């Protein structure tokens, strides 16, 4: 039981992201630590992070054959 209003949901910001990509890469197996280091929960950090990776690819910007 919920409503389409602010509260349960949580939108990230350029800042939260930038730092996320950094930490995530630093310790991809320490979400339990990055969570409290960023502000969001382990699940939130991982969930959001992973989402970014895919989001980036989708971006029209063509990938760099590597």
Swiss-Prot record:
HTH myb-type domain mapped to chain residues: 8-57
Cell location: Nucleus; Nucleus speckle; Cytoplasm
Disease implication from the record: A chromosomal aberration involving CDC5L is found in multicystic renal dysplasia. Translocation t(6;19)(p21;q13.1) with USF2.
Function text: DNA-binding protein involved in cell cycle control. May act as a transcription activator. Plays a role in pre-mRNA splicing as core component of precatalytic, catalytic and postcatalytic spliceosomal complexes. Component of the PRP19-CDC5L complex that forms an integral part of the spliceosome and is required for activating pre-mRNA splicing. The PRP19-CDC5L complex may also play a role in the response to DNA damage (DDR). As a component of the minor spliceosome, involved in the splicing of U12-type introns in pre-mRNAs.
Residue ranges of DNA binding: 31-53
The protein, known as: Cell division cycle 5-like protein
Family of this protein: Belongs to the CEF1 family.
Species annotation: Homo sapiens
Quaternary structure note: Homodimer. Interacts with DAPK3. Component of the precatalytic, catalytic and postcatalytic spliceosome complexes. Part of a spliceosomal 'core' complex consisting of CDC5L, PLRG1, SPF27, CCAP1, CCAP3 and CCAP6. Interacts with PLRG1, Lodestar/TTF2, and NIPP1/PPP1R8. Component of the minor spliceosome, which splices U12-type introns. Within this complex, interacts with SCNM1. Component of the PRP19-CDC5L splicing complex composed of a core complex comprising a homotetramer of PRPF19, CDC5L, PLRG1 and BCAS2, and at least three less stably associated proteins CTNNBL1, CWC15 and HSPA8.
Tissues with expression: Ubiquitously expressed in both fetal and adult tissues.
Processing after translation: Phosphorylated on serine and threonine residues. Has no effect on subcellular location nor on homodimerization. Phosphorylated in vitro by CDK2. Phosphorylation enhances interaction with PPP1R8.
Residues of the full protein shown: 59 to 111 of 802
Taxonomy, superkingdom: Eukaryota
